[PDB]
Nucleic acid binder design. Structure first.
Ligand SMILES: [Mg+2]
Ligand SMILES: [Mg+2]
Ligand SMILES: [Mg+2]
Length: 38
RNA sequence: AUUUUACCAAUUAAGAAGAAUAUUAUAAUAAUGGGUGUCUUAUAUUUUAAAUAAAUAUUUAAAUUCCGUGUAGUAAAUUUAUUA
């Protein structure tokens, strides 16, 4: 793998096109917005 | 002795279950992919990886900048909760 789909800004979302990115967590206990609430 | 010229005018009540567990938003309590006219045994029915996502964010300041694509806990399991 030399170029990951996250480079090309490809929108892969389940509710959008039924696809999800290969390198991600299946479950996320806290989303990015909760982590940023310092 | 039979014998009426040619042309020229218009849509109005509808009758009868021949109208509904009807359409569209609305339920913060369910959820292993629904397939009935189905039905033997699976070497043959395996999808996972720290990122923005079926999880979606109460402001007008300053500042990176050949000329601002922007605002932070409100309560620490606290009642904004994806419901049928
Ligand atoms: Mg006349
Ligand atoms: Mg009728
Ligand atoms: Mg539930």
């Amino acid at each position: 793998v030399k170029y990951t789909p996250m480079m090309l800004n490809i929108q892969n979302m389940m509710w959008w096109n039924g696809k999800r990115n290969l390198y991600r967590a299946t479950y996320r206990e806290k989303t990015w917005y909760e982590i940023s609430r310092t």
